[PDB]
Design a protein around this nucleic acid. Sequence first.
RNA 1: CCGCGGCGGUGCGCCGCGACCGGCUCCGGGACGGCUGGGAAGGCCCGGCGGGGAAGGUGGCUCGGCCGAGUGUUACAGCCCCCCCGGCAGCAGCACUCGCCGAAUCCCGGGGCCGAGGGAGCGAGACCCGUCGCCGCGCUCUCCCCCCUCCCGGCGCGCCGG
RNA 2: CCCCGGAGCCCCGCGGACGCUACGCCGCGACGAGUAGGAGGGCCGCUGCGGUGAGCCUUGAAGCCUAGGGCGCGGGCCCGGG
RNA 3: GGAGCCUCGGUUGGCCUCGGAUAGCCGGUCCCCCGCGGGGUCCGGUGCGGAGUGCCCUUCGUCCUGGGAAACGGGGCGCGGC
Lengths: 109, 236, 51, 56, 199
Amino acid sequence: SGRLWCKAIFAGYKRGLRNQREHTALLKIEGVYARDETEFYLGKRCAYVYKAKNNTVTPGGKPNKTRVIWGKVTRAHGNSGMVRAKFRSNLPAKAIGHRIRVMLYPSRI
Amino acid sequence: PHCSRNPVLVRGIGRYSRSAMYSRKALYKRKYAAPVLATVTKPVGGDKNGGTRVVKLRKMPRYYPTEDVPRKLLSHGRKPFSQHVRKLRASITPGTILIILTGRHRGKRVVFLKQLSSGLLLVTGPLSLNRVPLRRTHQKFVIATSTKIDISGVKIPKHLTDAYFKKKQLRKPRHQEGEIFDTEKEKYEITEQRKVDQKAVDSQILPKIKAVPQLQGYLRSVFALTNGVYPHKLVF
Amino acid sequence: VLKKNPLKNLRIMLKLNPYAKTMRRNTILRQARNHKLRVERAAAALAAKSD
Amino acid sequence: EPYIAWGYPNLKSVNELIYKRGYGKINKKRIALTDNALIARSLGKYGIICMEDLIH
Amino acid sequence: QVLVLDGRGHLLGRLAAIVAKQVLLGRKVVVVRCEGINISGNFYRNKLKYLAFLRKRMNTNPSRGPYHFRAPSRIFWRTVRGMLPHKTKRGQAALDRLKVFDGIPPPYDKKKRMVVPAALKVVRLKPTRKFAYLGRLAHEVGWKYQAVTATLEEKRKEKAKIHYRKKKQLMRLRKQAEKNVEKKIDRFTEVLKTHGFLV
RNA sequence: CCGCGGCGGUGCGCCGCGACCGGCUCCGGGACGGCUGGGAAGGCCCGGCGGGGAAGGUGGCUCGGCCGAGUGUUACAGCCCCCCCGGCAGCAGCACUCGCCGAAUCCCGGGGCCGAGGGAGCGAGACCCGUCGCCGCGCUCUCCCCCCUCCCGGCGCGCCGG
RNA sequence: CCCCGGAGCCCCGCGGACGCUACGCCGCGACGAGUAGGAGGGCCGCUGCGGUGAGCCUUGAAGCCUAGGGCGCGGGCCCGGG
RNA sequence: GGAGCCUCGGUUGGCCUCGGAUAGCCGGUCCCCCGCGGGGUCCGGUGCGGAGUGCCCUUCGUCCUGGGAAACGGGGCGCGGC
Ligand SMILES: [Mg+2]
């Protein structure tokens, strides 16, 4: 009857200084700030929940305006709890600093 | 009718030798001294006039498609889903408490019963407590909380299985045109044998969970993450 | 043919080298014997600490 | 020297380099060593007929 | 959902980098009491730094050229703007997210404010070194309202002293109530200390 | 037409799961070799021997309540440290993680990601298919025996016979 | 100690494609920068001619426009509407 | 009190002392001063802060009836006043 997802930030894409690989997203999960503690979220199903103008379908309910872009948390990113994800569709790059949802049900523990 | 002689030392690796298995299987003393155009193949028929007809069981086809795909290379290792090995996680034991995460029963705490014969977890929250039926779940979609009741002295019915938890709608031969064919009828029954099974299972579960203090309150509660609570921090 | 790794595939390792069967039968049986002997030494050490 | 790193390897090093990276030159082609028959056909007149003979 | 940071005792660029990163990560940050920001290196060094910044100006039209903000809140806004990619839309959105104040306004004086020890002077500078207050720096460059802000902060320190006196009175009532009730919550207090509370 | 009975391409779209393989990236364990055939260390200390910082002392002073603290003065051993005469399981480069090289003197198990694309029956009465090389193993053509025994049978929850 | 109008087989020395525009199909291995320049292939494009399509067409040719469906790495091409 | 268009962010809140860094927090104030409160002296409790942001506060299934511990609490965007 409450929240079943963890707060995270789409901090940007996999990029160098002047390059950009848009097929890999960088995710900052709130609460974890180290490489040792981000081993829990390896493989978790993640999504960017947004909404638009036109009504679209919804599994298990009436059609609404909300939409998602699903994905999968691939591996960690560099010593500070930053983690990587590869979505099945690329993010619009308007989601910089907005919430994404890392769920809890590729549960292995 | 004899079983396996060598034990499973490492999976895919025999235990003793070639020679010790030779001595045990005893290929010694088992040194064995052991060194058409006219008739029809398979008709089954008979007739009154002209004698008995020679029929052709499994006759030749009447149409061949003008293009077709060839055969395959036998794929060398593939087994169907009914012949797979069934895995279990180390935290899921018969008698634990599970947090269901993905269904419409979302965040609920369920006394776990047993692993079925299809890889799907059997699930029975008490219907008086948590409003959960006899329901299947999956291991990947469930956080297994390490709270284990004594459950080994119950009698689960054997007739409930993957063939028992199966949907039966969407039949073919209807008229298919109009305002018909499964857009109507709006419902699905409860099939009161399911009710009798639910009563016979939770009447054995409930006196073994009302002995532990506040356990029924923990089962009637629902799981939800809040501020300052992170799953890499809390232990379950 | 897809090259399967002999260090990860035991029957490919046996197709290239049939003595790897005994090479992996030993360091399982001998290491199990040595682990049993170290558990027996630890039990004798606990008996000496109790005595 | 300044463009290479060279050293004296070990038996397990030769084992990884021949089993995991076993690529032979048969008819000027880089063919994987998925069978002992390849080495037995190529070096059968030299006494090296298997992976173990080649490693030795 | 909004951080309220205190500018008292926090270093200028050390605080500005953390504020810039946390605002680019999509979070509303309100940095307040920015005349209490101290800058490492003594006052003549920091004053000649800002006077050289004042000397850097456009020759043909200085109204078109560099805008030299004297207030300490706008100096902090400038040193976060120099760290944000402010030529882009996400940098302009970050500048819209950041709200910086001189003194501390009545929308934020009755809020619990945060302290960053990763940008604080006692943590970062050696105690034998020197520093300079941004309030004194701004007042001797030309910012007008140090004294008005000082009187308003004196008024709200009196008000906060009254509030903290009332909080101490509520806390002594809470402690004497726990002393009265610890005979009838004997098995309510014990089940918190067997799991790790009140000890 | 009732059959998802067997084969083949498959689904209108959105998906999920299982097992297996290839490439990776990590984790938890187990046991082994060499050394100065490891160095110091952990335990009981024994009969001697020399030297040095300076202690339930001696003792100039200071600070307090016969007693405590600081400083300095000769310096024994009853505060300790180092070296020689000589010896006992007690060690595993050790989760008392004090610092190496490592591996036919080496192996097991687990977690996360990515991808599967190649298709050796186009026969008229005879299967629209298996499998080739490697490690095995189960049955049978050899016969016995012990235990758990579940579909089933018998007897009073227990026992007896695929 | 027999024939395969059929031993029935991972191989059929008995005729032998679904796979064969042999200028075709198929299987491995390595490689892939480029100006000036050189060579090859265009079922890329324009115009006219000799053959050819029992070719297309007032029940609508060429040309032109297109917020449509597409194909080819590409040169460009085939349809849908006016 | 009503559907119906557009644009979006969200997924409990924290309603507050100043202050020092070679120190600080909390008491009664038996003792004293100043305008019930503040300040000073002595004393007592913790100080890698449990009078803890490594923190605190709210439960996030419902209703039926019939007992125990606790409570005279809550509500009608409750009406008028300070
Ligand atoms: Mg919503």
